[PDB]
Curated annotation (Swiss-Prot), chain B:
Belongs to the universal ribosomal protein uS9 family. The keyword Ribosomal protein applies. GO terms for molecular function: RNA binding; structural constituent of ribosome; tRNA binding. The C-terminal tail plays a role in the affinity of the 30S P site for different tRNAs. Mutations that decrease this affinity are suppressed in the 70S ribosome. PROSITE patterns: RIBOSOMAL_S9. It comes from the Bacteria. Part of the 30S ribosomal subunit. Contacts 16S rRNA. Cross-links to the P site tRNA and weakly to the A site tRNA. GO terms for biological process: cytoplasmic translation. It comes from Escherichia coli (strain K12). This is Small ribosomal subunit protein uS9.
Curated annotation (Swiss-Prot), chain C:
SUPFAM superfamilies: Ribosomal protein S10. It comes from Escherichia coli (strain K12). NCBIfam families: PRK00596.1, rpsJ_bact. InterPro entries: Ribosomal_uS10 (IPR001848), Ribosomal_uS10_CS (IPR018268), Ribosomal_uS10_dom (IPR027486), Ribosomal_uS10_dom_sf (IPR036838). This is Small ribosomal subunit protein uS10. GO terms for biological process: cytoplasmic translation; regulation of DNA-templated transcription elongation; ribosome biogenesis; transcription antitermination. The gene is rpsJ. PANTHER family: 30S RIBOSOMAL PROTEIN S10 FAMILY MEMBER. One of its GO terms (molecular function) is structural constituent of ribosome. Part of the 30S ribosomal subunit. Can also form a heterodimer with the transcription antitermination protein NusB. Binding of S10 to NusB is mutually exclusive with its incorporation into the ribosome. The rRNA transcription and antitermination complex (rrnTAC) consists of RNAP, NusA, NusB, NusE (this protein), NusG, SubB, ribosomal protein S4, DNA and precursor rRNA; S4 is more flexible than other subunits.
From Swiss-Prot, chain D:
This is Small ribosomal subunit protein uS7. Belongs to the universal ribosomal protein uS7 family. GO terms for molecular function: mRNA binding; rRNA binding; structural constituent of ribosome; tRNA binding. The keyword rRNA processing does not apply. Transmembrane segments: none annotated. Keywords: Ribonucleoprotein, Ribosomal protein, RNA-binding, rRNA-binding, tRNA-binding. The strain K12 sequence is shown.
From Swiss-Prot, chain E:
PANTHER family: 30S RIBOSOMAL PROTEIN S14 (PTHR19836), SMALL RIBOSOMAL SUBUNIT PROTEIN US14M (PTHR19836:SF19). Part of the 30S ribosomal subunit. Contacts proteins S3 and S10. Belongs to the universal ribosomal protein uS14 family. This is Small ribosomal subunit protein uS14. It comes from Escherichia coli (strain K12).
RNA sequence: CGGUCCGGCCGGGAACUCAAAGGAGACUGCCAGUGAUAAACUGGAGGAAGGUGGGGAUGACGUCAAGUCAUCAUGGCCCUUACGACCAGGGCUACACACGUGCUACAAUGGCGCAUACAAAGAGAAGCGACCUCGCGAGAGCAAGCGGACCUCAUAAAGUGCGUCGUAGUCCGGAUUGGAGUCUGCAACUCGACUCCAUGAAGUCGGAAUCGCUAGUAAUCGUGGAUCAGAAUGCCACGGUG
């Protein structure tokens, strides 16, 4: 059947928001489009920079973007070389002054978005989907994941009839709200269509 | 010192104060007869003063907010009984038997998506 | 006279933790502190259709809880005013100063 | 009622005479969840019935109820494609519940000026056993004695 | 929606603040004052000569990313589909699946 | 139907009614303005009112004053 | 009883008895009895000929019965000769005010036929 | 309690109603019967709550090449001085009909007139808009408070008390149409809502057949909201009686 978003259902239980700011009905829409526009710029620019998560908070009349990345060195640059050029245009998009924070993603093979983006970038290089899935699973399980599940949908390997294939190793309790389930998506834009990647990583309870 | 007992049923909330002497009933600065236009709603507040004897033994200053006629009346019934145990505590046995100590947890069920009411489902058509 | 602080936040375990900071900072620097007064939460409910096309009964129901806190400080001591003004509070909490 | 073996809800007695059987009767008459206007029709019909029959408001109801009260009824059962009517002895609780239901339904089908008048004249017809309500017990009787072989 | 349909809305906004915000509002309140000019105003006639797209009522509320004219919510400025997509990623603050 | 505070008329059509009075009656007045209220200064003229495809010519009468020009130009073909 | 337009009002209450005339509803009947100085909850019995003619003179002010029927009919025919949308629908026996014709329009069309 | 313009309204009181953060509590735990001494069920005690206490959220592997290339994204195909683009007017609202979902009815458990008791949950600055005044009215003019447990939308209606109608196509029922208007909007002819006056269709309880609902449910009675310049009998939500 149809499943509930594992990140969405756990918001407030064991999962945090990607937008912490407060606003009234007046500027809630204006801030939400500004949030979309700032994420859009940074995902496009820091595509090779391995960006996993983007957190936006608005202290008074300012913007505080916290870029979660597996490669902070390429994001920061030569003694703030790349942070300064990003902050300069984030302040232009948002209107209010900008402050960018860089959070280091230690074990990226345990991050749903980075695992999904790795499978997506691999499928576009013409790698075998089964090899890409098995490697994603093995890498996660050997690094301490209590359980993992990776799903790839549509025209697999260039095939005419679309299939939905998945690998699962360990425990993946999607019904336990207490459970830490990191869920994310990624789309592989191949020469023969769009292949959707879905990754579930169980890290433990509480 | 005044003997107090809180009583509630549905969205109604009633506060009951007990002081000995006479058989007076004042609800929101009004009389028992002036507030309730139904005698069935008048008899339910008289119910705790049947098993536990009172004709002119004790007075009651009562105030109720929210709900409706039977809601407010039912809430006061629960309050008198709670103020009655506050005064003795040996009256618990008689009040349990009549079922006045129990808070009636029956609230109106929410309207659900896809349904015309709380449970009423829209008319089905095969073809 | 009296300084009225009105706190607004979508998260509850963030509003009363930022409120505790305001109450403590004021009562430590010697002021008369009324509250934390818990004012009613405005539950903005939203019902969106979960299917891109057709399927009218299938829906998603969400809410935005807007928690309210009222802190009234009676003594406007220079030791209290300056202590509260240079306080680092949570970025997701709105502070309304009423003179 | 396939697996779950439920009991029966014990309703509060009558606010006037303290009768549980009358509390069942007011609810049977009651429409659109209007209990206030429901007991108002039942008390006005009882006031006009006992006055025009020789008092005893509880007993005048009982005389009219004893004539409509059925002893046996048919139960629809399909065994081999064919639908057989099996005669079954009704329980004392349902005995009164069917008796009261036919009194209300026959008074509703009457052409009098008010429901307090329609009910009183139906309870008067039932006390002397010559109405639409006693005939519903009569048709239920002729149906039971006919299929007496499949008992 | 279409790029042309999105562009048509930018024009309807730019013309809404140019005229019917500081000029056409002045001649509409004038076409309501009973005390002054009951026949010789021409304000109803000069309102016509102003562009059509300048009226604020002629503007349609569309999903700020896709351009969807249906299923809109002013609170988020997005359509019900893109509201759900951002709500599940936690991109909408304080918004979570409610039950009561 | 509308507020008594001035009946409505299009300026491009109102100027066409003015030009037709002083210069004398011409051929049917080709106009798309169906929303305009008929004034007494129109009685006798031939206004070609659009229906969606062709311009329906309607001879203006005294009883036609107050009504809209689009009432005398059927929009939907039904046979 | 006999008032204005030949009709013979029943021996019911004054306000309901006056609604029998074509051109006088609930409001006109309440205003006619208020102007003539007569009660609304009084029957035709006790209402002498001196109280009847004062109501006849009162009701004579507004167009009623046959005089009103031709006035309604004249405005219907006016729209028809004009050639307007409003008139073309009184001529075709279909809803004039704008109501849907795809379904439910049986009051103006009349009962259906296969 | 002190003071009364008899209004929590003002000093005050933190008792209580309530508001909202944390915490306790219910587990067949106890007792008895049934049952393979088991599981479990039944009944009872205590308890605000008893056997997943009430309601929701939560929808396994998969099934129907089921729905959506018109939310968006997209392999391929097709148009590219046109299948693109701008504009006015029209159409999506047509009407011999048929089916599905609803609203309102057919009435005295009801219609009408006056008097009157009791809610819950929401919305609000390009906004909700009081009080006052004008109009029979929809509204209009003037103009406080309120970004809101403070102010406003907003009088809850069923119900109750009295009076009337008295089984009548009616003081039921409101369709349809005529006349005059109100507001929003550049603009209400096609094709808006609402008001005032008049009109007063069908319908007196629905064939074959068929649907919902097991308790604060059905039935009924009002209230709010999203979209929205304006446009709800739909939808989403709320309590009253029951
Ligand atoms: Mg596009
Ligand atoms: Mg619009
Ligand atoms: Mg009449
Ligand atoms: Mg709690
Ligand atoms: Mg579960
Ligand atoms: Mg198909
Ligand atoms: Mg299809
Ligand atoms: Mg009527
Ligand atoms: Mg069930």
């Amino acid at each position: 059947g149809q499943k509930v978003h594992p990140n969405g259902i756990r918001l407030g239980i064991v999962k945090p928001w990607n937008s912490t700011w407060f606003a009234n009905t007046k500027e809630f829409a204006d801030n939400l489009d500004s949030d979309f526009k700032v994420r859009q710029y940074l995902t496009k620019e820091l595509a090779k920079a391995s960006v996993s998560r983007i957190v936006i908070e608005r202290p008074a009349k300012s913007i505080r973007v916290t870029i979660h990345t597996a490669r902070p060195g390429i994001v920061i640059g030569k003694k703030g070389e790349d942070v300064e050029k990003l902050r300069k245009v984030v302040a232009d998009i948002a209107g209010v002054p900008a402050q960018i924070n860089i959070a280091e993603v230690r074990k990226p093979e345990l991050d749903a978005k980075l695992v999904a983006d790795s499978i997506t970038s691999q499928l576009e290089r013409r790698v075998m989907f089964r090899r890409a899935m098995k490697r994603a699973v093995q890498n996660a399980m050997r690094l301490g994941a209590k359980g993992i599940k990776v799903e790839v949908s549509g025209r697999l390997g260039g095939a005419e009839i679309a299939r939905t294939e998945w690998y699962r190793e360990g425990r993946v309790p999607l019904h336990t709200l207490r459970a830490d389930i990191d869920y994310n998506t990624s789309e592989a834009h191949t020469t023969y269509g769009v292949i959707g990647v879905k990754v579930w990583i169980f890290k433990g309870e509480i | 010192n005044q003997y107090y007992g809180t009583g509630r049923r549905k969205s109604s909330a009633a506060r009951v104060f007990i002081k000995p002497g006479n058989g007076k009933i004042v609800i929101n600065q009004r009389s028992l007869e002036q507030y309730f236009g139904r005698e069935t709603a008048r008899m339910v507040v008289r119910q705790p003063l049947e098993l536990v004897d009172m004709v002119e033994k004790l007075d009651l200053y009562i105030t109720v907010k929210g709900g409706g006629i039977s809601g407010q009346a039912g809430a006061i019934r629960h309050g008198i009984t709670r103020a009655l145990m506050e005064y003795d505590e040996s009256l618990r046995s008689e009040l349990r038997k009549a079922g006045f100590v129990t808070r009636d947890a029956r609230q109106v069920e929410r309207k659900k998506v896809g349904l015309r009411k709380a449970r009423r489902r829209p008319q089905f058509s095969k073809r | 006279q009296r300084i009225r602080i009105r706190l607004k936040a979508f998260d509850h375990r963030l509003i009363d933790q930022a409120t505790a900071e305001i109450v403590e900072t004021a009562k430590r620097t010697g002021a008369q502190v009324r509250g934390p007064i818990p004012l009613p939460t405005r539950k903005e409910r939203f019902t969106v259709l979960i299917s891109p096309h057709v399927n009218k009964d299938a829906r998603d129901q969400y809410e935005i809880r807007t928690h309210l806190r009222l802190v009234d400080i009676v003594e406007p001591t220079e030791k209290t005013v300056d202590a509260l003004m240079r306080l680092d509070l949570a970025a997701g909490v709105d502070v309304q100063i009423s003179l | 009622p396939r697996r779950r073996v439920i009991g029966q809800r014990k309703i509060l007695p009558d606010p006037k005479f303290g009768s549980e059987l009358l509390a069942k009767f007011v609810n049977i008459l009651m429409v659109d969840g209007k209990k206030s206007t429901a007991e108002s029709i039942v008390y006005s019909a009882l006031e006009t019935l006992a006055q025009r029959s020789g008092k005893s408001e509880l007993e005048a109801f009982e005389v009219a109820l004893e004539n409509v009260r059925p002893t046996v009824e048919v139960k629809s059962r399909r065994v081999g494609g064919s639908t057989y009517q099996v005669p079954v002895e009704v329980r004392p609780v349902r005995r009164n519940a069917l008796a009261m239901r036919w009194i209300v339904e026959a008074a509703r089908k009457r052409g009098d000026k008010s429901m307090a008048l329609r009910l009183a004249n139906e309870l008067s017809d039932a006390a002397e056993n010559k109405g639409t309500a006693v005939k519903k017990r009569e048709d239920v009787h002729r149906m039971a004695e006919a299929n007496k072989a499949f008992a | 929606a279409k790029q042309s349909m999105k562009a048509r809305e930018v024009k309807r906004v730019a013309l809404a603040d140019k005229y019917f915000a500081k000029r056409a509002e002045l001649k509409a309140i004038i076409s309501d004052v009973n005390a002054s000019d009951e026949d010789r105003w021409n304000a109803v006639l000069k309102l016509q000569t102003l562009p059509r797209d300048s009226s604020p009522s002629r503007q349609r509320n569309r999903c700020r990313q896709t351009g969807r004219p249906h299923g809109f919510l002013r609170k988020f400025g997005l359509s019900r589909i893109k509201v759900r997509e951002a709500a599940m990623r936690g991109e909408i603050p304080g918004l979570k699946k409610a039950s009561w | 139907r509308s507020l008594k505070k001035g009946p409505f008329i299009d300026l491009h059509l109102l100027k066409k009614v003015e030009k037709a009075v002083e210069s004398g009656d011409k051929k049917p007045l080709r106009t798309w303005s169906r929303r305009s209220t008929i004034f007494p200064n129109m009685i006798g003229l031939t206004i070609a009112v659009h229906n969606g495809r062709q311009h329906v010519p309607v001879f203006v009468t005294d009883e036609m004053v107050g009504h809209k020009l689009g009432e005398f130009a059927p929009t939907r073909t039904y046979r | 009883a006999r008032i204005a337009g030949i009709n013979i009002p029943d021996h019911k209450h004054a306000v309901i008895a006056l609604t029998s005339i074509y051109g006088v509803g609930k409001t006109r009947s309440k205003a006619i009895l208020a102007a003539a100085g007569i009660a609304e909850d009084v029957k035709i019995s006790e209402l002498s000929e001196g109280q009847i003619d004062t109501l006849r003179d009162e009701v004579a002010k507004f167009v009623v019965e046959g005089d009103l029927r031709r006035e309604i009919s004249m405005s219907i025919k006016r729209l028809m000769d004009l050639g307007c949308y409003r008139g073309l629908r009184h001529r075709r026996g279909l809803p004039v005010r704008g109501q849907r014709t795809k379904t439910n329009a049986r009051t103006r069309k009349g009962p259906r036929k296969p």
